Amino acid sequence: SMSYTWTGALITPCAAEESKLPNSLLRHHNMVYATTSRSAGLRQKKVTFDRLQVLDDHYRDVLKEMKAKASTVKAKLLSVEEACKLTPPHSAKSKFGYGAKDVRNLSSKAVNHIHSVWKDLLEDTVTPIDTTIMAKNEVFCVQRKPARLIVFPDLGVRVCEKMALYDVVSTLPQVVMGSSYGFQYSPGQRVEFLVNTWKSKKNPMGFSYDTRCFDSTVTENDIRVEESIYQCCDLAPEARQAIKSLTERLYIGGPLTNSKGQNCGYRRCRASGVLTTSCGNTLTCYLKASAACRAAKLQDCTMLVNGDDLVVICESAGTQEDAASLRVFTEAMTRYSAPPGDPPQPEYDLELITSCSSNVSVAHDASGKRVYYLTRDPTTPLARAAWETARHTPVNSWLGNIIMYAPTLWARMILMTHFFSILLAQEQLEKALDCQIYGACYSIEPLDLPQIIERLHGLSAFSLHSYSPGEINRVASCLRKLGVPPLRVWRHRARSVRARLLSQGGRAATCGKYLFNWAVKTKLKLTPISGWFVAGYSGGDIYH
Ligand SMILES: N#CCc1ccc(O)cc1
C-alpha cells in the first residue's frame, strides 16, 4: 500500500513558528535555522511511496527466534493512576475538555473519559482512530532539512497506550534482543560494549546502515508482526484486546487531521508519536537486519539497535569480499522494505563508525591510562545551544548534551562553561530543568551534574587530557565554521566561572572544582563524592 495518501489540505502550524535566531556563543547567526511547516510539502514528497515487501526464510527464522524469547516475558496491565502519573505536565491537552494537568491530578473528568476510551477499545477493534499531524520545530546548522512529520493521537488514547503497553515496551525489547538493544546502555556502558565487541573479533569490520525514512518503510504487515511478538507475552486478557485494538485502529494506520481539524489524508505506516514507536522500530530494525546479515553470509555479527539506527560489527572476509557482502546486505534490507539512505560502507576503524549520532574516541586520564569515551560532531549541539540561550524554550538540549557527552572536549570547554555562566549571572543555579534522555522527560538540578557525571562516566570525566587529533580538528573546525570563540578563549572564560562558583560554597563550589578542573593549571586532587539508560521512549509521551 501507499505509505501516505494526501487530500491536499496543508499541514498547518499551531502558533507562530520562528525559522531564525534574533551571540557570545556564535557570530554566524545566519547559519542556524529551525524547520517549519513551510517545508512540509518537501518532507511529504520524501516520505510517500509504495512499499514492495518480500520476506524470505531468514526473516522467518529470526522471527521464530524472537518469538521464543518474547514468550518468557510476563507483563502487567497499568492502572489509570500509574498511567496518569507518567504523562508529562505539558503534554498536548485533550480535545474532550481536559489537559495533562487534569490527567496528572486524577481529575474525575479526565479519568472518566480515559475509562470510556478504554471500553471503546475493548468493544471495537476496527474503526481507525484519529491522529493529529504536525511539522516538528527542530534547530539545525546550515550544511537544509525539511521538517519531520510528527503524528499522534488524543491524550485520552495516549494514557490508554500506557495502560496496555507501558510494561511491554519497558521490559520485552531487552529480553527479546539481548545485548543488541541499545537503550539499555548508558553512554559509557555503550562505549564499553562497542569497544569490547570490536576487540572480540579476529579481524574486525563494522558498518552503520542508514535506512531511508524508516517510519515510511515500516509496513502494515510489519506492525502486526510486532504485535504478534507482543502477543507472545503472558498477558492479562484485557491487555490482549486493547493491544489488538490499538494496533488495528492506530499503529497500523489511520486518518491524518491537521491543527485546524481538516483532513490531510491517511497514514499506512509508523506514526512517530505513539508509545510503541521506539520499541516497534527497534524490534522491526533488529529483526530485518538480523536476517539481512544471514542472507549476506556475514560472519559472527554483533548488532546494536536504537530504533531505526543500526550498527553491525563482524568478522572481515577481506576488503573486496566485505564490500560485496555489504551490497548483498543492502539488497535484503531493500527487499524487506528498509532501503538505503546513504549507501552503507565498511569501516576498519571503530572511531570512524557513526551510530546513534555518535562515535567512539580515545583520551587519557590523570594517570595517563587510555580512556575510551563517546562523542560526536558538536555542530547541532552548539547551534541548538545558541538557539536555547536566545529564545527561551521549555526544552534544554544543552543539559542533556552535557549529560550524554560530559567527557567530551566540547561539552566541557564550551557547554559547561557557557551555561554555568548564564546560570550564575541569572541566579538560577538552584532551578531544576526538564531535559530529554531516550525520549523521556526528567527534571534535573544543574548542581547535581558532578555526581551525575561521576555516576554515568566515572571520575576520569573530570580529567581527560590528550584528546585525539581527529577530535580536536573536528571541534576546532566546527568552531571556525560557526563563528564561535576558539577553545583558548573558553579556557579563560572557564577560569572566571570556576572562581565565581568556588566563592559560593556548597554544591556550586563542587561544580566549579570538578567541572572546571581542566581549566586551572595546578590541578586540585579529585576524590569521589536511577532508571535512566534502560529503555527508549521517544515519541512516547513519557515523564519521570
Ligand atoms: N547519547 C546518546 C544516544 C542518542 C542521542 C540522540 C538521539 O536522538 C538518540 C540517541
The domain ranges of the chain are 1-50+128-153+253-268, 51-127+154-181+219-252+269-275, 182-218+276-358, 359-544
Residue 63's Cβ-side half-sphere holds a number of Cα atoms within 13 Å equal to 16
Comparing CA positions, the residue from 206, 193, 250, 208 lying closest to residue 227 is: 250
Tell me which residue has cell 510539502.
Answer: 41
Q: How far is the CA of 5 from the centre of ligand 1 (A)?
A: 31
CATH number of 182-218+276-358: 3.30.70.270
Tell the residue nearest (CA) to atom 1 of ligand 1. 404
Query: Can you give the resolution of this entry in Å?
Result: 2.8
Ligand 1 atom, smallest distance to 374 CA: 1
- Rounded CA-CA distance 399/159 in Å is 28
Comparing CA positions, the residue from 402, 397, 374 lying closest to residue 387 is: 397
Cβ neighbors of 22 (< 8 A, separation 6 or more) are: 390, 391
- Rounded CA-CA distance 541/105 in Å is 17
Tell me which residue has cell 507475552.
Answer: 233
Cβ neighbors of 188 (< 8 A, separation 6 or more) are: 373, 374, 456, 457, 458
Tell the residue nearest (CA) to atom 7 of ligand 1. 356
Ligand 1 atom, smallest distance to 405 CA: 1
- Rounded CA-CA distance 285/209 in Å is 10
Q: How far is the CA of 419 from the centre of ligand 1 (A)?
A: 21
* DSSP state, residue 37: G
Which of 194, 354, 356 has most ligand 1 atoms within 8 Å of CB, for mutation?
Answer: 356
Q: In whole angstroms, how large is the CA radius of gyration of the chain?
A: 24
- Rounded CA-CA distance 305/214 in Å is 13
- Rounded CA-CA distance 403/418 in Å is 15
- Rounded CA-CA distance 78/166 in Å is 7
Handedness of CA 498, 504, 505, 507 (dihedral sign): negative
Rounded to the nearest 10°, the torsion over CA 66, 67, 72, 75 is: 100
Rounded to the nearest 10°, the torsion over CA 354, 467, 529, 505 is: -120
Query: Where would I find the H helices in 258-342?
Result: 277-295, 319-335
Question: And the C-alpha cell for 361?
Answer: 574516541
Tell the residue nearest (CA) to atom 10 of ligand 1. 356
For 171-288, strand residue ranges (E) read 204-210, 234-235, 254-257, 263-267
Per residue, what are the HEC states of 176-197? HHHHHEHHHCCHHHHHHHHHHH
- Rounded CA-CA distance 530/532 in Å is 6
Tell the residue nearest (CA) to atom 4 of ligand 1. 356
For residue 299, list its beta bridge partners: 315
Question: And the C-alpha cell for 187?
Answer: 553512554
Residue 210's Cβ-side half-sphere holds a number of Cα atoms within 13 Å equal to 12
Burial class (CB in 10 A: 0-12, 13-18, 19+), 516: buried
Q: Is 358 strand, coil or helix?
A: strand
Which of 404, 436, 437, 452 has most ligand 1 atoms within 8 Å of CB, for mutation?
Answer: 404
Q: How far is the CA of 112 from the centre of ligand 1 (A)?
A: 37
Q: How far is the CA of 245 from the centre of ligand 1 (A)?
A: 31
Number of CB atoms found within 10 A of residue 112's CB: 12
Comparing CA positions, the residue from 411, 519, 397, 506 lying closest to residue 457 is: 411
Number of CB atoms found within 10 A of residue 211's CB: 27
- Can you spell out the DSSP letters for 149-179? EEEE--HHHHHHHHHHHHHHHHHHHHHHHGG
Residue 294's Cβ-side half-sphere holds a number of Cα atoms within 13 Å equal to 14
Which of 208, 278, 354, 357 has most ligand 1 atoms within 8 Å of CB, for mutation?
Answer: 357
- Rounded CA-CA distance 510/429 in Å is 13
> Which residues, judged by CB distance below 6 Å to any ligand atom, belong to the binding site of ligand 1?
187, 306, 356-357, 404
> One-letter amino acid identity for 413?
M
Cα–Cα distances (Å) from 216 to 2, 94, 386, in that order, read 9, 27, 32
Question: And the C-alpha cell for 315?
Answer: 568478522
Tell the residue nearest (CA) to atom 5 of ligand 1. 356
264, 150 contact by CB (below 8 A): no
126, 137 contact by CB (below 8 A): no
Comparing CA positions, the residue from 374, 283, 297 lying closest to residue 329 is: 297
Cβ neighbors of 261 (< 8 A, separation 6 or more) are: none
Give the method used. Answer: X-ray
